[PDB]
Design a protein around this nucleic acid. Sequence first.
RNA 1: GGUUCACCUCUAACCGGGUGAGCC
Length: 22
Amino acid sequence: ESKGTAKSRYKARRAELIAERR
RNA sequence: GGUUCACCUCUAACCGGGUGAGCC
Protein backbone atom coordinates (compact mmCIF):
# COMPACT_ATOMS: atom_id res chain seq x y z
CA GLU A 1 0.00 0.00 0.00
CA SER A 2 0.81 3.50 -1.18
CA LYS A 3 4.08 4.30 0.68
CA GLY A 4 6.92 4.95 -1.75
CA THR A 5 8.86 5.27 1.60
CA ALA A 6 12.13 3.41 2.29
CA LYS A 7 10.34 1.52 5.18
CA SER A 8 7.69 -0.15 2.94
CA ARG A 9 10.26 -0.97 0.18
CA TYR A 10 12.56 -2.43 2.88
CA LYS A 11 9.53 -4.52 4.10
CA ALA A 12 9.13 -5.86 0.51
CA ARG A 13 12.95 -6.59 0.51
CA ARG A 14 12.52 -8.44 3.90
CA ALA A 15 9.68 -10.53 2.32
CA GLU A 16 12.05 -11.33 -0.65
CA LEU A 17 14.81 -12.30 1.89
CA ILE A 18 12.17 -14.61 3.55
CA ALA A 19 12.27 -16.51 0.18
CA GLU A 20 16.18 -16.62 0.51
CA ARG A 21 16.85 -16.73 4.42
CA ARG A 22 19.01 -19.86 4.33
C1' G B 1 10.55 25.86 14.27
C1' G B 2 7.46 24.65 10.10
C1' U B 3 7.09 22.01 5.54
C1' U B 4 8.31 18.69 1.43
C1' C B 5 11.03 14.96 -0.40
C1' A B 6 14.70 11.16 -0.55
C1' C B 7 17.56 6.99 1.82
C1' C B 8 18.96 2.90 5.59
C1' U B 9 17.63 -0.59 9.42
C1' C B 10 14.73 -4.18 13.53
C1' U B 11 10.28 -8.04 12.87
C1' A B 12 6.39 -12.86 10.01
C1' A B 13 4.38 -8.18 11.53
C1' C B 14 2.57 -4.45 14.90
C1' C B 15 5.49 -1.43 18.03
C1' G B 16 10.44 0.70 17.23
C1' G B 17 15.74 2.71 15.89
C1' G B 18 18.78 5.87 12.44
C1' U B 19 20.34 9.02 8.17
C1' G B 20 20.61 12.42 3.88
C1' A B 21 18.76 16.68 1.24
C1' G B 22 15.57 20.35 -0.34
C1' C B 23 11.94 24.32 0.53
C1' C B 24 10.24 28.11 3.94
